[PDB]
Amino acid sequence: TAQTVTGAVAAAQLGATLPHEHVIFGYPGYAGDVTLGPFDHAAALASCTETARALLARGIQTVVDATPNDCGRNPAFLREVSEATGLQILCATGFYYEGEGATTYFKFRASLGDAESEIYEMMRTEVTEGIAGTGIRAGVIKLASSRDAITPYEQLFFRAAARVQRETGVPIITHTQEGQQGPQQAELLTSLGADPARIMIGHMDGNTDPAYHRETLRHGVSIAFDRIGLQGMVGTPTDAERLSVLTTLLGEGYADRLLLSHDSIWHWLGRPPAIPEAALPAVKDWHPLHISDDILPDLRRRGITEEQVGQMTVGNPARLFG
Amino acid sequence: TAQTVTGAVAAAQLGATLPHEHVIFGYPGYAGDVTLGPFDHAAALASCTETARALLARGIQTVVDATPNDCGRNPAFLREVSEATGLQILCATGFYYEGEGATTYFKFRASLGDAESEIYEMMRTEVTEGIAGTGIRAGVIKLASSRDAITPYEQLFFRAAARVQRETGVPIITHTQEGQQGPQQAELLTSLGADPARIMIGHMDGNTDPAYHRETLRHGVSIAFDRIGLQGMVGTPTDAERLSVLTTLLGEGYADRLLLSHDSIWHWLGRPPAIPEAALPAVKDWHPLHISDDILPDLRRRGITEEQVGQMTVGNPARLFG
Ligand SMILES: [Zn+2]
Ligand SMILES: [Zn+2]
Ligand SMILES: [Zn+2]
Ligand SMILES: [Zn+2]
Known part of the structure; x- marks a missing residue:
């Protein structure tokens, strides 16, 4: 049973799923720019429901x-977008990595007490x-770490999550x-007793060395190439490079542990980015219709079977989130 | 004319003022702990109005x-506390220092464009x-810097503010x-053409070397001993030490450029701190009634005249904020 913003749904009902996307997103501090960067609810609702309908048209019935x-999480809004289109959406519980999150609060709590237990209670x-007295439950726990290490701050969340x-x-x-x-x-979460069949290490497409992926897959966890379409920003590689590594892994029988998404942001919070x-x-291709329109057809063209595509897009998410 | 959350008031109406306090305050990230750290509005309103009335009882008619x-700024709430007690409250516009603020947003804007102009537009x-389409205007601009330097991030705000x-x-x-x-x-703001008669360098009581203060006063700016009562936290000195430096400066004729406050937080946002x-x-003495009850009477006992006390608490704020 997967918990979505509109209630629990049988794993069989999830269908084709995009496991990592952002309906709305705002970098910490966006709220302080409310005067000139307010949230136009009607505009947001219209834009997001349109994208939701575009996804449903492509066979995608669920978005995580x-x-x-x-970073702007708003379950009520997500629920609104879901009830208006029928698109199933799971939301998360967790804080962003130390490098970009609003870290002051829990760094403070951690100095005056047991932040871990508090973070554990929240999750x-x-x-x-x-969440926030709405009855809307998080369907997943979101964890994030920095580039050079899983910082002590971040580990507070990893431990509470496990x-x-x-x-x-x-x-x-x-x-x-x-x-x-x-x-x-993967090492940290599994050593803490977390179920590796319910873990998805994200942004794994950010590394182009297959050894890095296999070395992560060794822990039994699933990995996601969830920034497909984002070619160049924040150090990311090109899609050509992503698919090269992905086809190699598929050729090594890892289909059952590979997932695909875009890490798109449908509507930004704060002033629209320039x-x-x-x-x-x-x-250019960093939008939620990229995988359906360009990626999956391309994989098929290069030899990937329909069974493998079904495995990555339906089989895997049904197991991981169902 | 000073701009408060309930409209403009003549400088003559300001009266005894606490130039740096916090009705409500939350460290960045507190909003992410909304589930277990929600804002109990009625409780907050009751507690804050009570403190407002306690201040009015001591002759204090205005709080900045x-x-x-x-960091949780909420003009609407402040306005509510003001209309319910008659206490005049000015609110601010600005972001916190890089070390503890929600810096991700504007650091991002600064990489994709002219953050300074954007920050300038906001202010x-x-x-x-x-603010936020409420008609409530900020009566002051709040600036903040880190310990080892005024970072490039922070300078974006200093430049926009000037x-x-x-x-x-x-x-x-x-x-x-x-x-x-x-x-x-002081050097930076004055070199940018800012009016030194409308600048108050805060948390100056954080340094116990009078040379440091005089060296700051050289710029014609006013300085505030605004954490009176906070003895030990975040490196702060004891009040005994604060008053030693303050009496020395008063003995050097700086009364017209010295202000006093507590940097108190009436109601914390997020889970109550442990x-x-x-x-x-x-x-123990870190609350808004400390200066009125213990400090001013003590200054008088050690030789400070009533004229000087009036200068610091009424004369100075009328000029700086009026
Ligand atoms: Zn991410
Ligand atoms: Zn993401
Ligand atoms: Zn401060
Ligand atoms: Zn303060």
Whole structure:
């Protein structure tokens, strides 16, 4: 049973799923720019429902919204987008990595007490009871680490998460910064007793060395090439490079542990970002319709079977989030 | 004319003022802990109005709320507390220092464009038009720097502020981290054309070397001993030490450029902080009634005249914020 923003749905009902996307997203601090960067709800609702309908048209029935608690997460809004289109959306519980999250609060709590237990309580409540007194439960726990290490701050969340996972069985999806720490996250979470069949190490497409992936897959966890379409930003590689590594892994029988997504942001919070035309190519295909329209057909063209595509897009998510 | 959350008030109406306090405050990230750390509005309103009334009983008619945009600032709430008690409250516009603020957003904007102009637009609008479409205007601009330097991130705000100051005349109050950068802030703001008679370098009581203060006062700016009562936390000195430096400066005729406050937080956002009894003495007198009840009477006992006390508590704020 997967927990979505509109209630629990049987794993069989999940269908084709995009395991890591962002309906709305805001970098910490966006709320302080509310005067000139307010949230136009009607505009957002219209834009997001349109994208939701575009996904449903492509066979995608479920989206896992990976937005951390400190990056604009809004379950009520997600629920609104879901009830208006029929698109199933799971939301998360967790904080972003130390490098970009709103870290002051829990760094403070950690100095005056047991932040881990507090973080554990938050996650447990949001997963089993609800978020902000809305009854909307998180369907996944979101974890994130920095590029050079899983910082002590971040480890507070990893430890709390592993515990909620053991006692709830809820799935865990993560963020790896600039193609590193995938093996470490997997090692850390599994050593803490977390179920490797309910863990998805994200942004693994950020590294182009298959050895890095296999070394992460060794832990039994699933890995996600979830920034397909984002070619150039934040150090990411090109899709050509992503598919090269992905086909190699598929050729080594890893289909059952590979997932695909875009890490797209349907509607930004704060003032709309100014995209310099020099970065236009890098974000050209960075939208939720890219995998369906270009990627899957391309994989088939290069030899990937329909069974493997079904495995990555339906089989894997049904098991990981169902 | 001073701009408060309930409208403009003549400088003569300001009266005894606490130039740096926090009705509500939350460390960035507190919003992500909304499930277990929600804002109990009625409780907050009751507690804050009670403190407001306690201040009015002591002759204090005005409070300058220094809460940055990214630390829980809520003008509507402040307005509510003001209309319910008659206590005049000015609110601010600005972001916290890089060390503890929600810096991700504007650091991002600064990489894709001219963050300074954007920060300038925000401040200008909030000071001259209103905040979040409420009509409530900021009566002061809040600036903050780190301990080892005024970082490039922070300088974006200093530059934008100096510009709004020149064209609006609005006052500027600041945050200095761990007793440093006072001279630099004053130097920087004055070199940018900002009116030194409308600048108040805060947390100057964080340094116990009078040379440091005089060296800051050289710029014609006013300085605030605004953490009176906080003895031990975040590196702060004891009040005995604060008053030693303060009496020395008063003995050197600086009364017209010295202000007093507590940097208190009436109601915390997020889960109530857990105060280890070991820190009980350090925060014992860290509340808004400390200066009125213990400090001013003590100054008088040690030779400070009533004229000087009136200068610091009424004369100075009328000029700086009026
Ligand atoms: Zn991520
Ligand atoms: Zn993401
Ligand atoms: Zn401060
Ligand atoms: Zn303060």
